[PDB]
Amino acid sequence: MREIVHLQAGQCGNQIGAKFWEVISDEHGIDPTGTYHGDSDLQLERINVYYNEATGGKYVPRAVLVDLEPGTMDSVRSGPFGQIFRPDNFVFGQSGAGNNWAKGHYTEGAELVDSVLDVVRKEAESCDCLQGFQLTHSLGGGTGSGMGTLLISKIREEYPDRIMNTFSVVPSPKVSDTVVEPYNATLSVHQLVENTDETYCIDNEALYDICFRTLKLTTPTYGDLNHLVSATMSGVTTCLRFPGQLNADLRKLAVNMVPFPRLHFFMPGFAPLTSRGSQQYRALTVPELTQQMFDAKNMMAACDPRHGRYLTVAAVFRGRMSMKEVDEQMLNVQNKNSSYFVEWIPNNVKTAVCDIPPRGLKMSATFIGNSTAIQELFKRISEQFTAMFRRKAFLHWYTGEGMDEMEFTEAESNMNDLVSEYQQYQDATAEEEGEF
């Protein structure tokens, strides 16, 4: 009964999602044509979480693919595992965005919206009991949330009533090489909080560092960067798909990681990542997974955890395992550095044991964490709106469209207060007297 519909937006949703669907097709045992050629029965028992049976033994995914450029999702439909998607789910526009955020919200207001809503409707309703949705996208481009708060303000009307995850690619802190860039960082936020509240923020700079320093791949493309996120997406849904000794679905993760309703921050991580020449010389034990998933290196978000406090930790593991090693991770690191595990929460770790491991690997994990060091992620974006907002010089391209600039200035006000709300629960202690 419990089921997920995958919405992919942009190149980023489409390229990450296409890698995600081939991962799940390997995990469940589906060939590129769409039939089942698996070597087990539990690879088929709960395949009504991501695939629908079509007549002829042809399993078809449940992803609707959304983009405003026709060209992008022709490569998706002609990829390795690319013909599995049903054509009606492939919903295209004719002109997208570019350069100006102000163009992005004074361009295609409502054309492609209702077409997607029809596809999202039929695919959700022709089923049994909706666990929720998941959305893959990045925060960038020539629109930011310009198409976003244009198109999705028509979809957010009733969507926050059930579960909706979002694996979002947050901008990287390297250089500003989009010329008139620091106007799409300010106008991005608005409802950046109160419509998902389960966002798995994934930076590309941190994606390279795990590929350079941890995986030691000499030439990492964007493709194998999309392999790392696909493991995490599979990780947070493996207890729903495959049986386990300690089950934990999306809601059980969401309930057990979100104390306050404004916490769309879950920095991901995959524990058993090893180089090819070093995989042979690897122990692969329960402590070995735990010392990597909690490490600052294996964090797919450019925020060092030792800059703040873990408000809550999830430990969805995969295999035949233990969990008490994670208890020593608090008791050593928490009681000695109390600033790395929030003390007004007694135990900060949720664990899960899903019996079936990933392919090839014997044992794995999937860390997501609500650390209060994510104040810095929406602070690098914070010094990257203030830096060029005040001049408004190349904004004459914006000015031609140029919507209300209170909406320019209210978005960061709904972002710096989010930082403040994280600064509070990083500094808030049990006996509320000693911080004043």
């Binding site: 306050f260 030792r306 109390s338 790395y340 403040s420």
Partner: protein, 219 residues
């Protein structure tokens, strides 16, 4: 002597160091105000009438026919500075124009949220008292204002969560500082019921959404 989640600091005997800090409960450096630039220009029709009742503001032009769309966001921007010959004009001038006139406090509400959160974001224990008194006075001294602030709780309340439980634990020894109200937590609390008693229905949930410690009164 260690960092955290490393191979080091997992041994049987280790000591460590935490983060730099958390930037909360701490005074932030102020910025130059538009109140400062507009006062030295002489555009304000105000005068510090040094009364023998304490200081008062004498208005050369009558308060009823002022352009409130150009003055209330400009007086509210002066709350984030503490030097005397400007901070009193912000404190007294806001209170003077709030209790005078009607049917014009309403259209200036949505352009008043930015200068009222900026003074609250300073996090110093002096003007946070001042902004809490004008927040109590804003909802009272007009008609149908609490309903206007219900969709704007998301930009005023996050600072009120930080200092909500700021009180004195003097169990028996009596305090004497209730004449001039410096108790932040009582001022945050009393503003919250002033927020909830006005605005009608669908107002307790907007406060409960974001300061969950609060107990919804008016049952």
């Amino acid at each position: 002597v260690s960092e955290g989640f490393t191979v080091k600091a997992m041994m049987k005997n280790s000591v460590v160091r935490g983060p730099p800090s958390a930037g909360a409960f701490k005074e932030r450096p102020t910025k130059p105000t538009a109140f400062r630039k507009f006062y030295e220009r002489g555009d304000f029709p105000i005068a510090l009438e040094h009364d023998s009742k304490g200081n008062k503001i004498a208005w050369k032009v009558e308060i009823e026919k002022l352009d409130y769309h150009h003055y209330l966001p400009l007086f509210f921007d002066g709350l984030c500075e503490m030097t005397f010959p400007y901070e009193f004009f912000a404190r007294q001038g806001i209170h003077d124009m709030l209790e005078h006139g009607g049917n014009k406090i309403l259209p200036v509400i949505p352009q008043l949220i930015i200068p009222i959160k900026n003074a609250l974001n300073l996090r110093n224990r002096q003007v946070i008292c001042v902004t809490l008194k004008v927040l109590q006075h804003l909802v009272v001294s007009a008609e149908m204002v609490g309903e206007a602030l219900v969709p704007y709780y998301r930009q005023i309340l996050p600072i009120l969560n930080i200092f909500k439980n700021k009180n004195v634990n003097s169990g028996d020894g009596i305090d004497y500082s209730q004449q001039k109200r410096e108790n932040i937590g009582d001022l945050i609390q009393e503003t919250l019921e002033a927020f909830e008693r006005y605005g009608g229905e669908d107002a307790f949930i907007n406060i409960k959404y974001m300061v969950p410690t609060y107990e919804s009164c008016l049952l």
